[PDB]
Amino acid sequence: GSSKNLGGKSPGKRFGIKKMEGHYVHAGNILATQRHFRWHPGAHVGLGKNKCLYALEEGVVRYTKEVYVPNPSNSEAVDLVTRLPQGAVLYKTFVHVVPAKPEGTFKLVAML
Amino acid sequence: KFTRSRIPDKVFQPSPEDHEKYGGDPQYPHKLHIVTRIKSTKRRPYWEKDIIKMLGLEKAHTPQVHKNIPSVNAKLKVVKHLIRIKPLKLPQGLPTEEDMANTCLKSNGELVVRWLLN
Amino acid sequence: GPRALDLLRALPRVSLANLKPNPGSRKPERRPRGRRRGRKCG
């Protein structure tokens, strides 16, 4: 016969994890890019409009399992929390960046 | 797909009869290995070729001595089907600086410090 | 100063029969003849 399926060809977007645990990253480096929320951002990690995670401070990347407390203004998420039984808590994965360099140091500039 | 083979740790648990069969010491493990390559790196994957190269086993049927630390044993387990491993025995102990040039390694796996004296 | 001039007294006279270019100044040319540079000429 004849082919009915069309348009199935599309290259991958290379969605995945870029920096593993222990990698030393600087400010602005994209930790990971994703389609859906696979890894939630953590401490010192921003979140772009396309759900990509980028480090805000220079340091060591760490991955952690933590609890999930949704924003009350998010109607869909708060409804899911409402229907949970009393003994359960949501758990999600997070990406952290523990800072390495200190904020600054005091130096002698002038001795009057 | 053909990939690397993961060896379960249950294989490397010796039976009580293993020590008597192979002449091992039940309490004190031996100190040094003697590794001799038997088969060829050809018709084998590339990761097995590199491990042979980085262990000094390029030439077959030439003994090579390696430590018994886990770091070396980790690499030997990958190519354990291409080499022959025997313990290094020291009937006269470690050679001194005086007898360095008279050492000879017998086939059975012992190092004789004084070989063909006088 | 030029201690090499002392060596020139012992050596024979310099003429057109014995002159050599500085080594490495003239890389030889490769022609497409033989087994190596042959049957395809690169």
Partner: protein, 55 residues
């Protein structure tokens, strides 16, 4: 433009730059021309050194 015993110049350069680098610098001696070649950018240090020796 070096005249005389070039190997004397090379040895004097080697121990002059040794404390600065911690190792003997790699040098080439070209007696047919009279040129000493030193691996690295030491032009400013050498010019001061030769000026003190009065060349």
């Amino acid at each position: 433009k070096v005249e005389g015993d070039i190997w004397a110049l090379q040895k004097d350069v080697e121990d002059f730059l040794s404390p600065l680098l911690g190792k003997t610098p790699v040098t080439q001696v070209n007696e047919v021309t009279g040129t000493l070649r030193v691996k690295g950018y030491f032009d400013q240090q050498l010019k001061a050194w030769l000026l003190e020796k009065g060349f």
